[PDB]
Amino acid sequence: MAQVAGAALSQAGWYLSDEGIEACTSSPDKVNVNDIILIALNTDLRTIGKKFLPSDINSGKVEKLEGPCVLQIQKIRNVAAPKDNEESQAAPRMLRLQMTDGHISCTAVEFSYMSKISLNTPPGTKVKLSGIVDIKNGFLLLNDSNTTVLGGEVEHLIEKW
Amino acid sequence: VMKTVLMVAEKPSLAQSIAKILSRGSLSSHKGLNGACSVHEYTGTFAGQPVRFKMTSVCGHVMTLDFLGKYNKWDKVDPAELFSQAPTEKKEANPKLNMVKFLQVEGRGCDYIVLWLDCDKEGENICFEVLDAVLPVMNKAHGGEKTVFRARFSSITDTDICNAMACLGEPDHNEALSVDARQELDLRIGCAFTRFQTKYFQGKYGDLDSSLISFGPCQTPTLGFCVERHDKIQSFKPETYWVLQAKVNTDKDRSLLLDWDRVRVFDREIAQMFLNMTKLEKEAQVEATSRKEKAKQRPLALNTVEMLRVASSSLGMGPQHAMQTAERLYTQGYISYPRTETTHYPENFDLKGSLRQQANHPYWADTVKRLLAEGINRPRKGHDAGDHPPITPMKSATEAELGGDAWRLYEYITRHFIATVSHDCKYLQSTISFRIGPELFTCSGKTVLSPGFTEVMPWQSVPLEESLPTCQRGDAFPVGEVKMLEKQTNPPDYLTEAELITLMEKHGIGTDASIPVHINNICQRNYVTVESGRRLKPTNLGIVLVHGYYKIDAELVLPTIRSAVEKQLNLIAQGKADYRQVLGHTLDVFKRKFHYFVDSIAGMDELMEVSF
DNA sequence: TACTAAA
Ligand SMILES: [Mn+2]
Question: Least buried of A30, A39, B199, B571, by fewest C-beta within 10 Å?
């Protein structure tokens, strides 16, 4: 049922509004949580998200983030390399991710070397933050032990430019 | 009765060497009617008959290419007629040497002519000029047999010379008519563009009066590198680093300055967060220790490009000045031939004998004496190009005999040679990594275990740094201060002479004997002015000239047309295409560029108005 | 008057 599917998403970690979830549903027929998750993953989060990020995250009033949360990535820029030379090897790679939920946008920093997330990651890709995440100075700290990329099929807007 | 065979070499040194090798020490040598070209006579057996051998040497290109007199008047005909309606003949280079008359007088009665010029291109052109000069002088062939012989060799060795004497070939007309076509294209482009440029720009601007604006397939590409560097310097946006550094005290008076593993962060907020996670802390813990042994590789044999580079960077000498000094040294008989490409010492080179000459100099007395006692390391295997052996010292010298200019070049040559034979510098690298909270830091140092070529070239030395303190994993030291360093990215400096030579050699713009001239040409025509550190600064005239070239036709400055047009001309050398079509076609394509240049010259004139 | 490139 619709309530059963909503509950299933609730423990799955996705937080989406009622308009969003009736948007993701193909029809009031037999639709599984798997296809609901896939359809939501395809859709842009800025129109299906809820108010679940605790707000004021850009300030220092929040200590840590808990629970498995799904977030979208807007911009990725290498803070260890200059704008002109985006592939310089003089510094280890270290990425700053602008991470939205559709309502409030936070900023995360790569604390340990990852492999899944790279500069050639399409904007709109989604990640899951299962575990405990540290909010140091209004900045999320991302580790390979609490970040899982779930892919993404959203209309690309960068086009390498 | 005794027939005579005349042989010709491309330089007096090669002439004397080959005569000594063939004659088994029976030289009869005397100067000719030049003072710079000699004649060596001896006797031998040729074509199964006892005959006399007479051998001499030309001094490079006997002849060069030039238009007729009328089309040199610069006013009778516009440069457009130079491409197709302008005949070209051959005049004499260095007319004071009277080389054509020398070859005329030497050869009266030589039944057979044997040739000993270099096997590369630009040697077949010289051999065919020598043939065209000497043929109407000799005593013909009594029978129907042949007389003109070409000898091919790869190195100046007994076995190679004997094999070249055993097997004899013929000159390559198809190879000669490739450098011939290249000379014709160079003339008819660089004399039809420069005339238009200096009759258009000098005819409008008074500040450029009595000045020359020159174009060429090498000069303009050479200027292109400097102009590109100037463009990159002018268009540059500095940014703001944020590097964090730390100090650790071990016992006393030893404060190690650490370096950040994430060497830089381009965000004030992230840098501040990383500081906040570190500054409120007072213990650092060791985690890693490395004592790997490394080595610095000894330099290869000296090449002409490397000699020019080092003379510009360290000795503070211009390329042409360094080349003239090297030529004076070689003529005086101190170093060997200063225009090479090889970097591999030949097998027969008497390294022990040559290194024994510098066994008494006060500068190398300790190093040379030692290196001759425990054995000499074999030279590095570099590259061979069939040219002359690399620049090595040949006779002993002291600051009294030489001046203040040749001695310094000799000092580097005799020091680079010893470093090529000595050992390597083995330095032990020690790295210690601490952990001040979540972040990481490392400190590195170098200690010399056994200096090798360092003692003969002190400028290329492992710097003296204090040894790192002993510490194994599990030791904790007090922490001092941690702070940001608001560094800023700096724009690149101007192009130096050393860097330009590497750029010139990579694209093959100039040869070994032409690199100094091209760099001097753009510096003597006010295109580029030299500065401190031997840096090249494009001038107002240079900036407007190259920039206008890009707007009109980029195929005049790009450092790829010179290499590409040479590849097209290699078709004649390999016999695939005939001489006329390739030269005719490549002249037509350059004729359309000139007509597109003349009708669009107003594009370049707009830029000059701001400048002059 | 020059010019170009090269042994
Ligand atoms: Mn040669």
Answer: A30
